[PDB]
Design a protein around this nucleic acid. Structure first.
Lengths: 337, 5
DNA sequence: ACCA
């Protein structure tokens, strides 16, 4: 069925499924539509024989230079996507709800790439975007397909962040604290202002693009302090570094960050240590540091994140496209050939 | 445009 | 150096 966003009882039942599923993702929460307020939300779900939700997909519809919309279910759907017969049923419900308005429904779930899964999806009629587009870089897909994820279940007895690391890394993490860096955290306008200062400073330093403050304000309005937390590192009253982490489903996800110009005393490592500590304190399975471009010392994202993730990066299946208007799909999407 | 999110 |  399609979710009626104006029925609070239905919305709460959908949210309860999303928040309690092991496949839950913050980008599939209905609060994500409030963040992405320039996109149109369309949400669908399936029920078991007793009427309980068993699978859900939160879609956001965006504009294109054509008459068609782009339908996108970020890190969805919320279910076991390797159960492809059930995936087909949910995708069929989503297609009914789109009512021919979109040229594609794209979803990019956090499931490992494998040849067997890629082949099954193609056998079921989907177009996949992964290793065939890898040569285009990190931004070949909307979200990074290679991600540095710390599996904390490998350390069931860890009490503090340092318990996860070899001595050489313990030293790297201890250094900012020894040098007077202190970290606080919260989800108020005060911490958001501190974040935004460091985030805009980082973006200007790298010549890259950056989101307006209202984006993060909508996120702070949508998610409470048990879900969204801004960590702020200072040394003797000087603001040094920040980061935003979101706790949802089985992971705490380091999403945005920045540092001020000048000497920062390794403050980003202190931010990471506290974000990891939040994961340990809440018994969360995964700490996700997010995307890299390649598993190489030439990639500075990998170098930094490899300090905290010694295992191999997780490589996901990438973008799964249910093609709805093939003429528009061919005009707007390249297949990597 | 750039890390997603 | 970057430490997103």
């Amino acid at each position: 069925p399609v979710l009626n966003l104006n029925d609070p009882q239905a919305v709460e039942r959908y949210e309860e499924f999303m928040r309690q599923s092991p496949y839950g993702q913050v980008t599939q929460d209905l609060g994500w539509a409030k963040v992405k307020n320039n996109w149109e939300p369309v949400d669908v779900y399936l029920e078991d024989d007793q009427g309980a939700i068993i699978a859900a997909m939160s879609m956001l519809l965006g504009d294109t230079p054509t008459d068609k919309k782009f339908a996108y279910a970020s890190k969805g759907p919320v279910m076991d996507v390797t159960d492809v017969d059930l995936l087909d049923r949910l995708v069929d419900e989503a297609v009914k709800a789109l009512d021919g308005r979109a040229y594609v429904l794209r979803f990019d779930p956090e499931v490992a790439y494998s040849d067997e899964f890629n082949t099954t999806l193609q056998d079921h009629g989907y177009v996949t975007r992964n290793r065939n587009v890898a040569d285009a870089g990190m931004h070949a897909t909307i979200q990074p397909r290679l991600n540095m994820v710390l599996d904390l279940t490998k350390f069931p007895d860890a009490k503090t962040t340092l318990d996860l690391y070899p001595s050489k890394t313990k030293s790297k993490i201890k250094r900012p604290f020894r040098d007077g860096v202190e970290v606080h955290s919260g989800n108020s306008a005060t911490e958001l202002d501190e974040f935004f200062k460091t985030y805009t400073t980082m973006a200007e330093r790298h010549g890259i693009t950056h989101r307006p403050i209202e984006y993060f304000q909508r996120m702070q309005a949508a998610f409470d302090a048990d879900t969204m937390r801004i960590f702020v590192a200072e040394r003797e009253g000087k603001l040094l570094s920040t980061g935003i982490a979101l706790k949802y489903g089985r992971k705490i996800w380091y999403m945005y960050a920045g540092s001020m110009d000048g000497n920062t005393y390794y403050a980003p490592y202190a931010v990471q240590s506290e974000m990891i500590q939040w994961a340990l304190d809440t018994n969360t399975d995964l700490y996700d540091l997010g995307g890299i471009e390649s598993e190489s010392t030439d990639d500075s994202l990998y170098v930094f994140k490899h300090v905290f993730v010694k295992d191999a990066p997780r490589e996901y299946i990438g973008e799964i496209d249910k093609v709805l208007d093939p003429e528009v799909y061919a005009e707007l999407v390249k297949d990597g050939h | 445009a750039x890390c997603x999110x």
